[PDB]
Structure 1
Amino acid sequence: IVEDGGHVFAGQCYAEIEVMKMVMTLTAVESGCIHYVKRPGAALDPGCVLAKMQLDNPSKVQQAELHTG
């Protein structure tokens, strides 16, 4: 329901889908610039990736994996 490169808010709806023949509010949870990734109409499974976004508050460092047997 938005477009690419659009600022959003916490708690702001960003998509709406039909599941089990019924609607679902895809509520956004964090504010920032969205770039819509997974193009619409495709079936998806839990834990998929639908978008990236550039938030306005960056945060701490993140993962670096090193362990191998």
Structure 2
Amino acid sequence: MENDPTVLRSPSAGKLTQYTVEDGGHVEAGSSYAEMEVMKMIMTLNVQERGRVKYIKRPGAVLEAGCVVARLELDDLEHHHHHH
């Protein structure tokens, strides 16, 4: 329902096989952020846009079609204020 761009969800029910990036791993659109070994075959999860991926579920947890496996830190508050 609330499919926001700053989020991530598995396409189908599977299982967290491993991870290609730690919590908040900066990855651009198309870049894999994790993986999920389903009863069918092995696959890699990637982001739909540029941003920092934040793991939500725990390692080994079973993925579900629609469940949020992670998140996305989109450049929303891209404030340009640097002065030191």
User: Which residue among 26, 44, 54 is the counterpart of 2:73?
Assistant: 54
Larger radius of gyration: 1
**How many positions carry a matched residue from both structures?**
57
- What are the equivalent positions in structure 2 for 1:1-69 lying under 5 Å apart? 1-20=20-39, 22-56=41-75, 58=76
* Superposition TM-score, scaled by structure 2 size: 0.58
Q: Distance in 1 between matches of 2:63 and 2:35?
A: 14
The runs of 5 or more residues in structure 1 that have no matched partner are: 59-69
Runs of 4+ with deviation above 3 angstroms: none
**Superposition RMSD in Å:** 1.5
The runs of 5 or more residues in structure 2 that have no matched partner are: 1-19, 77-84
Higher relative CO (Cα under 8 Å, sequence separation at least 6) belongs to 2
CA deviations over 1:18-46 (Å, ceiling 9, x no partner): 11152012122111122211012111221
